[PDB]
Design an enzyme around this catalytic site. Structure first.
Site, PDB file in Angstrom:
ATOM      1  N   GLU A  13      -1.626  -9.520   3.789  1.00 51.67           N
ATOM      2  CA  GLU A  13      -1.121 -10.187   4.984  1.00 51.67           C
ATOM      3  C   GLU A  13      -2.202 -10.398   6.036  1.00 51.67           C
ATOM      4  O   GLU A  13      -2.047 -11.272   6.897  1.00 51.67           O
ATOM      5  CB  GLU A  13       0.041  -9.392   5.588  1.00 51.67           C
ATOM      6  N   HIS A  53      -4.091  -5.021   1.497  1.00 52.83           N
ATOM      7  CA  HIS A  53      -3.090  -5.702   2.317  1.00 52.83           C
ATOM      8  C   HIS A  53      -3.377  -7.194   2.348  1.00 52.83           C
ATOM      9  O   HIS A  53      -4.336  -7.624   3.019  1.00 52.83           O
ATOM     10  CB  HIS A  53      -3.078  -5.132   3.736  1.00 52.83           C
ATOM     11  N   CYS A  97       0.842  -1.186   0.000  1.00 53.39           N
ATOM     12  CA  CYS A  97       0.000   0.000   0.000  1.00 53.39           C
ATOM     13  C   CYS A  97       0.881   1.241   0.000  1.00 53.39           C
ATOM     14  O   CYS A  97       2.061   1.189   0.358  1.00 53.39           O
ATOM     15  CB  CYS A  97      -0.948   0.023   1.206  1.00 53.39           C
TER      16      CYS A  97
END
Lengths: 562, 562, 562
Positions: free
Chosen positions: B528, B526, B399
């Protein structure tokens, strides 16, 4: 600028308001501006959302909103005014922190209690110091006090913040006046000083140093008790001051002068003082006691309230009667009568305590009914109001009680048994007292009449107008929200119930009088707030003179105190 | 319902999230619903007004808003989801109290801290218990934890509230797991345990009793240390658990089983358990370690960030790389490169650490640049991105960093040196990246794209679409507020920079790719957060295979892990 | 008179003895007498009834009795001596109060803790101040330190007593130096300062104010850590001193000078100082480091003890070897060998660590065996002593170990396997080492040889006599109680075991030597106590030169350091 900090003690409610206020009036007459800053550790608002008549009062004395009741002792003995910025509560601080985090003032990082909270409290101290009263320059010594006891969670951020404020300035620019209580049970006799030792130990467990040892007791102790405090508290022998249960509230400045602790503050702050006689002015405190503890006529004043004894919901009432009785040499003789024991339910259950309250009411010569709490005890005040209007007894209503007196006049004199206010029973056919809110500029919904409100008179020859020197526009505080319906007021024009007190729009009724009665005045505002020992309230002077038949001779001389 | 309380300790930041999460994943496989309730004693918001990339991250994992980052360890090892009601902060509680006092809930009287604040916290515990996850019935055991250390002012109301909650229920319906730290300097040698003795003493100075003695150390102690603490803490000899510095984070459940403390919770809560092998499932934790500590190919992964070492602003990044490297047998080898030491100012000042960060980056075969903090270090990531596109080096932007890559493509390939985003320098002639807020129903002003947001694909044959199994509509979290101007995107159509990722209105660009490059994917969300040991994130699998040239053979077999 | 108070902190054992001793040696060279007063909060005696060789040592250095071991750091870096009145324990204070209540000193009334205990501690401070060292006038600055951590019950009466002592004198006649610890685990990285915040908070919760902020760490911190201590501890920014793990013990004065905290004590106490170069003497501390961290010959020294690593029972041994190795340019290389792992039982059990301790001992060229603990490990020192006399290896016995060497000489050389000391097995036919107590004037029962004891030499040409300059009467401390039976010493006259060290009555043997061996000296006293950096101990110099074959050339030149 000097700052005097007064922390809590073992108990909270014995009389800590008049202890810290004695140091303010002692330096005000010398030529030093003294300000007061109240700190409330309670989470809830001190008077915004507090109960009306239960565990306190709505102290509104020259302020746009409402503050704590403890600010009354800091304005009667002095001569300055305060605002809403003086009273600081824990709930008010939590409102501004959220606004700063949303906008972005703490660099976006998280905040804690140190140094994120101890510095925010010091900023409010500078804002009040730079904004003095109307008619001064800059204060020199401040009186900082806090509520509650010592050893609470709500009081931890306050002690930590005040411990750092003294390090930013010089050593002689800050002091501490710790107050304590010395208990003495009637079954022991010996002054076993042990709860006091634990109170002074908790204060020293944070970073502060007690300078003015204030101990509250019940009798003047000897000399063997003060020797133990010098080693247990680890302070000076001359810093311990003995305070016992005084007779009134104005005897506090007269006690600290005899112990010899006035000159201790001058050597601690290193300031100047231009005295005339001995420290403070002796032509005001000593001359005031010569008009009360001398000759008394023993006036019987019996009022009706909620509790059978004195409490915290009648603090401003018992203090205003003392300042008005010393001018005509009278003794404070007040008895509390519960309004719940004046109905038909009490006689059908316990008639022993029912007839006892009637024997103390008919023998008296003064009726001063304040306000109730909800609909508990409304029928008891109706039977008490009709006894004064039919036996030429003086009657005076502060607030709320006027709504219960206008209904009684419509049932016995007029004849409207169905007439009832909308607060108790709104489903009625004769809506006498309704709810008339006010819509100001910027305010939404139904607000409450409170703040800077100016009332306008109507009639000319009135017993209440001549007390103020025949004016034309007077300003007074208010708190009531219900008003009188202007539709049913046309019937009262043909009777003796005249309307001598209106508002600005001439749509609300406040001060009303009755023709033919020697003394029957009923208002809506509170005259006890606008009173002081230098000039008592005019309404409370007409009630004392009417109880002893000394009112007609007060207007002929020209009203020396108007 | 059972409740497990995990208080603080001597230190706050050693890893208390993986300690309390071990008891939740152990009873979840047996057939018991486990929920997590996070308590934040900080006054500021945990992630609402917190800094972006500085001392934390914006943890948004299946929630309409944002909560604390500590909730990540309670969702990876388990399989349930949480909401905004689980995370409770001190600032959020102070907002509802003002609303209740203004309306009228506490009978008009004032409130304090007891029993006015201890009962309000217990009410939030019942609201989360009655609202479980989507696909269950009612939780049986809860995991309650709090941040910070022990002895702070912000943690006092939490201990007092939890001390009474255990008395309302039965004795076996509440437990306590106190965590501590056992320091041991390298200049002493002997395990001089002293800070741990003071941590267990302060917890017992309120009313609680420690049941699970958790001590954090750095090496397996002997038998003379456990017998010494049992007499100081006045607890059982089997309650002391030895915890040292583990190699990773999944070795916590494997340590408590060897000490023999699993059966202690069964006799304390009096519950049932249907085990298969030994307590918890042994066909998942033991089989996971057999794919990491065996054969490794030693892959070099070099990323560019804000700090030269590991900190708290890169916690969710180092945990997602471990779950994606065990599937293809790789060793965790990550080096932190500061973006501020990659500009021309660092070369003219201290060139010692300038070429050192480039030496470890060119030897690697994978670029994973997250996001920066403001305009500090933006020019450093431009030089590192212009080389990955020329030396066939894999690059993946999480990002914010995508804004610095679209400008580089317009300067080297196109030729627009004046093009710059509006965040750094808004006064430009080629407004490439502007600020495009979203105006939802009921929201005022310029909001931020965060929460339940669904993205729509665009092109067909894409390397990122085949990783998810060729879908059509994927939902993912977001936090960015700046978007690409749809006016200057027409020039990129004639080049290799294609737009394969749009939104719903087809006006915002998120996922972009470059033609001709073997692996160059730049997104905005994102990946993750949407990862777990049971199924890692697809985007993080294409970066590992590209570093070892094992990506073309993953799509031909049909993607066994999609 | 000035007084420096050094309280505890987070840990009590990391090295607080050398921290408070740095301020004493810095002002001693300027011309100010510095004294030390040790405070022990333990109930048991610090060294009277304490264990011999277990968790401490019997520190006897120029005193009629025994005091704490922490007094060693206040005498090596300085040049004054102390007595038994400097060490004050809680058990000693409890003995004098009983003697005063029985006689009649407190007016027959009961006593408490205040002001009955805080005043008694201040009386012992004046007694030590009026009795300086032998060769001075009156001390000006005192170093007061106490043991243990902060917050214990045993440390409460000490803080309350020292809080009042500063109020009796002036403000600039007392200071405070609080020492803390900053832990930093290897799994966190960021210096999370939290245990230090709790240590400084408890000290301020009694009435004291920290002046010298001492923080112990493991690496030089930057500048962002010191900014948090200035606001959390509410102290000055220049008062925070950074202390990390140093290389030795003499680097403490060299660290406080670079931070710039020496001139802060001058402005706090308002005293004078006649400096030559920069504050303290620079021709002693800087010149001492130029003989250690330069050229080293790497000498291997292997000793046999009770523990396999360094602990508290070998503190005075590792410090005396450093002062004797810098004179001949040597590097400190010492390995601890356990005596319990040298017997036949260890070989049959775990032979892993059996031959490992022999491998590191045979490669060395010096044996320095101290004393054991009871009969645990006595057979292990026999096998290590029988080889040093056959492979021309130097051996030096401090204390107790001599009893195990005289028995070995009677078994291998002579042939008396039945000979054994009376301490291990008294039922023997050859009572070699028996218990010979001393009956002094006024003492009853069997006393112990400890205190001011003078030994007399015997032979002339001895290797130990020429080290002191060929004297005739030397005084040295002792602690042993067992002696050699003068009946079986007639057999050793025909062999090489000569007796060159007797007592006054010529009935006890202390220093013995062996003919034919190049360096085999076995004594009974402790030479490490009578050592100092200005003049090391002669016995410890003959062992270092014998390990490098540089001893014969030291006597020919005339012994420049005798």
């Amino acid at each position: 600028m000097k700052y005097i900090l007064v922390t809590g003690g073992v108990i909270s409610g014995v009389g800590k308001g008049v202890i810290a206020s004695s140091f303010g009036t002692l330096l005000k007459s010398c030529g030093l501006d003294v300000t007061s800053i109240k700190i409330d550790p309670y989470i809830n608002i001190d008077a915004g959302t507090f109960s009306p008549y239960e565990h306190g009062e709505v102290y509104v004395l020259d302020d746009g909103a409402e503050v704590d009741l403890d600010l009354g002792n800091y304005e009667r003995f002095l001569d300055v005014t305060l605002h809403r910025d003086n009273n600081i509560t824990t709930g008010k601080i939590y409102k501004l922190v959220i606004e700063k985090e949303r906008t972005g003032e703490y660099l976006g990082k998280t905040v804690q209690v140190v140094p994120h909270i101890t510095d925010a409290i010091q900023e409010w101290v500078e804002r009040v110091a730079q904004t003095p009263v109307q008619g001064s320059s800059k204060p020199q010594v401040c009186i900082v006090e806090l509520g509650g006891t010592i050893g609470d969670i709500e009081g931890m951020p306050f002690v930590e913040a005040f411990r750092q404020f003294q390090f930013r300035v010089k050593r002689e620019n800050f002091c501490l006046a710790h107050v304590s209580l010395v208990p003495l049970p009637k079954a022991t006799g010996e002054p076993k000083t042990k709860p006091t030792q634990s109170s002074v130990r908790e204060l020293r467990g944070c970073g502060l140093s007690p300078d003015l040892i204030v101990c509250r007791s019940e009798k003047p102790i000897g000399l063997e008790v003060k020797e133990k405090i010098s080693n247990f508290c680890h302070v000076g022998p001359d810093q311990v001051i003995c305070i016992h249960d005084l007779n009134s509230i104005y005897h506090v400045p007269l006690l600290m002068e005899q112990n010899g602790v006035i000159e201790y503050l001058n050597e601690r702050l290193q300031l100047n003082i231009d005295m005339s006689k001995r420290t403070k002015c002796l032509q005001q405190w000593r001359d005031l006691a010569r008009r009360t503890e001398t000759v008394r006529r023993e006036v019987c004043i019996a009022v009706v309230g909620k509790y059978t004894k004195f409490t915290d919901s009648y603090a401003s009432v018992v203090k205003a009667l003392q300042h008005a009785a010393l001018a005509v040499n009278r003794k404070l003789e007040l008895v509390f009568i519960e309004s719940c024991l004046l109905e038909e339910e009490t006689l059908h259950s316990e008639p022993s305590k029912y007839h006892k309250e009637w024997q103390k009411l008919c023998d008296s010569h003064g009726i001063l009914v304040p306000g109730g709490f909800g609909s508990r005890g409304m029928e008891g005040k109706i039977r008490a109001c009709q006894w004064a209007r039919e036996n030429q007894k003086p009657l005076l209503g502060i607030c709320l009680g006027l709504q219960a007196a206008v209904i009684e006049f419509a049932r016995n004199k007029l004849g409207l048994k169905d007439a009832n206010t909308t607060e108790i029973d709104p489903n009625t056919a004769n809506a006498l007292v309704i709810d008339m809110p006010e819509h100001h500029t910027g305010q939404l919904g139904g607000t409450m009449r409170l703040g800077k409100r100016i009332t306008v008179f109507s009639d000319g020859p009135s017993v209440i107008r001549q007390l103020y020197g025949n004016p034309k526009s007077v300003q007074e505080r208010h708190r009531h929200r219900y008003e009188v319906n202007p539709k049913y007021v046309h019937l009262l024009e043909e009777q003796g119930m005249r309307f001598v007190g209106t508002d600005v729009d001439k749509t609300r009724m406040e001060i009303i009088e009755l023709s033919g009665h020697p003394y029957f005045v009923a208002t809506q505002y509170h005259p006890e707030y606008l009173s002081r020992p230098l000039k008592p309230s005019p309404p409370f002077l007409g009630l004392i003179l009417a109880s002893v038949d000394r009112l007609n001779q007060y207007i002929q001389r020209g009203c020396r105190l108007s």
